[PDB]
Amino acid sequence: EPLRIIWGTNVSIQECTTNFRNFLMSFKYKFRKILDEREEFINNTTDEELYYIKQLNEMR
C-alpha cells in the first residue's frame, strides 16, 4: 500500500495521526499532576474530566 513517511526519517504519519487523535480523545489533567510530582493536589472533578475534549467543545 502507499506508506507515507516524513522525509529523512522513519516515522510513519499514520502512527503520529492516530497517536495524536488518541491523546486528544482521552486525556486528563491528573496525568500532568502526577507527572509534575503534584499528585496530592488532585481533586475529584476537574482533574478526572477530559481536558481537550472540553477545550474543543468550548472552541466550537
Partner: protein, 615 residues
C-alpha cells in the same frame, strides 16, 4: 598552463602525516585517543600541535630514518594541509566504542537509503565534508620548543597589522592587537542538499566561495535515462552548516609608527572557535592569511587588487583596614585621607534599597569634588575609575556605568543636555530613548563621580559658596557628599609636596616608606565581598540618627541665616547619612549598624565642606 618542478611530494607528506597520527606518543597514541573520543561524539574539534610534529621529526631523524620537514611545509602552505590532515583522519577513524542512535540522524537515514537505491540499480557518492563531525585547527610552534631544537618559529612570532604584507599570504602567522568589532554568529553553508520531485533522489553541492549558483535541473541517472525533467529544490534540513563570525583586529598604540594612523585586519572564525573573541580584549590570534577573490562582474571590474582576511586557528588571551585602603587608593598623590575615605565609601556603595512602597531611597553615595586647579583631581578620578570594575571615564558611556560608579571629568564644562541626562540618571535611575529609529529604555542605577572647577576658575572667599558653583543648586543638594579641595600656600606643605614629586620623578617609585601599600587585588576583592554583604539597623540607632538629624537641621538653619552656608540640611541629607552608615557597616562586615559608623559618617560630612571652608 605551464608547469613547474617544485621540491614537494604530497604523497610522502601524506604518508608522514598518517604515520605521525598513528604512531606518535607523548598509554596509547595521543591523537588516536583523540580520534576515539571524536568517534563517540565526545569531541567536536581536533587541534594539531606543531610541537608534536617537530618532536616526531626529531625522533625520526635520531632513529636514522630521516623524513621530510613537515613543520615547514605546514607553515608555508597551510590550506592544503588542512584537507590532507582531514583525509588522514578519515582514513584512520576508529570504530565507535559507545552505541549511538544512528537512526535519529537524518543524514544516516538518507545515506542508507541512497545505498539501498544504488544496490537496486546495480542489481538491475557523497562529499567527505558532508559526514565530517569535527573541526581541524593548527596550534602554532611554541618559541621554547623551537629554541630547544634550534629552529625559528615564524608562526608564533607576534606581528603587527603593518608587518603583515602580501608575501605572507598562504602562511600560518600570528597577529597581536585589540579586537574592535565582533559580529553575530551566523550559519555558513558548506554542503547543500537538493531533492527531485520526480526522481526521488538526493543531490549535493559543495560551496567554497562567497557566492554560489543553485541547481535547477536534475542530474540523476534515472532522470537522464527516462528523460524526465525534474526540478531541484533546496533542503535546509539535510544541509551542512558551520558557525561563522567576522571580527576586526586593530593595531595597538605602541605599534603604530610616528605620525601614522592605525590599521585593522579582518578575521574569520569558523567552527568551535566562535565566541572566543570579544571587543576590547588584546589577543594573539593565530591563523592562515588568505585572499578573498571576488566573483562575477565585480571580479572583472576590481582588477588584480585582492582583499584579505585571517582564518582563526588559535586564540591566546592576555591577562586599621580603612586607613590602609585609603592610603593605597592613590599612593602617588600627597596624603588626602578624608577624600580617600569618601572615595572608598562611594566605591563600596553599601545600601539597603527595598522600600517597596512605590519608590526606594537611592542606593548610590554620589561624590562630587570641586576645587581650584592644582589639586590632583584627575589622578583621583583615574585611580578610582581603574580600581572600580564598572568604572567609566568620560570628559564633559552612562550605559557602561550602569550598576557602577561613573567617572566624569570637567563636570562644569558639560553641556546642558548631558546635565539633564545625569539629572534623569540620579532622580529616576533610568535611561530613556525616544526616537523614531528606536525606542529603548534601560535601567541605570549608576553612581556618579564629578570633578568641577569654580565659576572664576579658582574659589573666591569673598563670594558665597553657591556663587562660586555654576551648577544648579538642586544638583548640589542631590549630591550625597560634596568635597571642597583648595590649595593654600604654606612652607611646610609645599616643601613636602615638592620633595614627594621630585622623588617620584627620580626613582619612579613611591617615596613613602613608613607603611607598605596593600595589594590592589586584595583591596578590590575585599570591596566585592563588602558589596555582597547586607547590613541591618536597630531602633536605638534609628533614634540616635533622628537626634543627630534634628541637631544638624538646627545648626544648618542657623548657618544659613548667614550667607556662608552651602545649603540647609534636608531629608536628602538624612537619607545620605543612613546610606553612608550602611556602607560603613558593610565595610565592618558586621550586620548590626553601630553608633561608631554613624559618628564616622557625621564627621565625614562635616569635614567634606566645613573643614576646608573655615580655613
Amino acid at each position: 598552463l605551464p608547469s613547474i618542478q617544485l621540491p614537494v611530494d604530497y604523497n610522502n607528506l601524506f604518508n608522514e602525516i598518517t604515520d605521525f597520527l598513528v604512531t606518535f606518543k607523548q598509554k596509547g597514541p595521543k591523537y588516536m585517543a583523540m580520534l576515539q573520543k571524536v568517534a563517540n561524539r565526545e569531541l567536536n574539534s581536533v587541534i594539531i600541535d606543531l610541537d608534536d610534529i617537530l618532536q616526531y621529526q626529531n625522533e625520526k631523524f635520531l632513529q636514522g630514518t630521516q623524513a621530510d620537514d613537515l613543520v615547514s611545509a605546514i607553515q608555508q602552505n597551510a590550506n592544503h594541509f588542512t584537507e590532507l590532515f582531514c583525509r588522514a583522519i578519515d582514513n584512520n577513524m576508529p570504530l565507535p566504542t559507545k552505541e549511538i542512535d544512528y537512526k535519529d540522524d537524518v543524514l544516516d537515514v538518507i545515506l542508507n537509503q541512497r545505498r539501498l537505491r544504488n544496490e537496486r540499480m546495480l542489481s538491475d557518492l557523497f562529499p567527505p565534508n558532508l559526514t565530517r563531525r569535527y573541526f581541524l585547527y593548527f596550534k602554532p610552534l611554541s618559541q621554547n620548543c623551537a629554541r630547544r631544537y634550534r629552529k625559528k618559529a615564524i608562526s608564533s612570532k607576534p606581528l603587527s597589522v603593518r608587518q603583515i604584507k602580501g608575501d605572507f599570504l598562504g602562511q600560518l602567522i600570528t597577529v597581536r592587537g585589540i579586537i574592535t568589532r565582533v559580529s553575530d554568529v551566523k550559519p555558513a553553508v558548506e554542503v547543500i542538499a537538493y531533492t527531485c520531485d520526480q526522481c526521488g533522489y538526493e543531490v549535493f553541492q559543495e560551496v567554497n566561495s562567497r557566492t554560489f549558483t543553485p541547481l535547477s535541473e536534475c542530474t540523476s541517472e534515472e532522470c537522464s535515462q527516462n528523460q524526465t525533467k525534474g526540478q531541484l529544490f533546496m533542503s535546509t534540513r539535510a544541509s551542512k552548516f558551520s558557525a561563522f563570525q567576522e571580527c576586526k583586529i586593530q593595531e595597538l598604540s605602541q605599534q603604530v609608527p610616528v605620525g601614522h594612523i592605525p590599521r585593522s585586519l579582518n578575521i574569520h572564525v569558523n567552527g568551535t572557535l566562535v565566541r572566543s573573541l570579544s571587543p576590547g580584549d588584546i589577543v594573539d590570534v593565530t591563523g592562515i592569511f588568505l585572499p578573498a577573490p571576488y566573483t562575477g562582474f565585480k571580479a572583472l571590474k576590481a582588477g588584480l587588487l585582492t582583499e584579505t582576511y585571517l582564518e582563526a586557528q588559535f586564540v591566546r588571551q592576555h591577562k586599621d583596614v580603612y586607613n590602609r585602603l585609603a592610603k593605597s587608593i592613590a599612593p602617588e598623590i600627597y596624603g588626602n585621607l578624608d577624600v580617600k575615605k569618601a572615595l572608598l565609601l562611594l566605591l563600596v556603595g553599601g545600601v539597603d534599597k527595598r522600600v517597596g512602597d512605590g519608590m526606594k531611597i537611592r542606593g548610590d553615595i554620589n561624590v562630587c569634588l570641586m576645587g581650584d586647579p592644582g589639586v590632583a583631581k584627575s589622578q583621583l578620578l583615574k585611580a578610582i575609575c581603574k580600581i572600580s570594575p564598572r568604572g567609566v571615564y568620560t570628559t564633559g558611556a552612562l550605559v557602561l556605568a550602569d550598576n557602577g560608579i561613573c567617572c566624569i571629568d570637567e563636570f562644569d564644562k558639560m553641556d546642558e543636555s548631558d546635565r539633564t541626562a545625569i539629572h534623569e540618571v540620579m532622580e529616576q535611575q533610568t535611561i530613556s530613548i525616544s526616537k523614531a529609529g528606536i525606542n529603548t529604555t534601560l535601567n541605570a542605577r549608576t553612581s556618579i563621580l564629578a570633578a568641577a572647577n569654580p565659576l572664576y576658575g579658582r574659589y573666591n572667599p569673598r563670594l558665597s559658596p553657591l556663587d562660586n558653583i555654576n551648577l544648579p543648586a538642586a544638583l548640589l543638594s542631590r549630591f550625597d557628599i560634596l568635597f571642597l579641595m583648595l590649595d593654600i600656600p604654606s612652607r611646610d606643605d609645599d616643601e613636602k609636596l615638592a620633595e614627594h614629586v621630585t622623588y617620584v620623578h627620580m626613582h619612579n617609585k613611591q617615596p613613602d616608606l613608613d607603611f607598605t601599600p596593600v595589594e590592589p587585588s586584595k583591596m578590590r576583592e575585599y570591596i566585592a565581598y563588602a558589596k555582597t554583604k547586607r547590613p541591618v539597623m536597630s531602633e536605638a540607632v534609628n533614634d540616635y540618627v533622628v537626634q543627630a538629624y534634628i541637631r544638624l537641621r538646627q545648626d544648618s538653619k542657623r548657618e544659613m541665616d548667614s550667607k556662608f552656608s552651602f545649603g540647609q540640611a534636608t531629608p536628602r541629607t538624612l537619607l545620605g547619612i543612613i546610606r553612608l552608615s550602611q556602607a560603613l557597616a558593610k565595610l565592618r562586615l558586621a550586620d548590626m549598624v553601630d553608633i561608631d559608623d554613624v559618628e564616622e559618617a557625621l564627621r565625614l560630612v562635616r569635614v567634606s565642606k566645613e573643614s576646608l571652608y573655615q580655613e
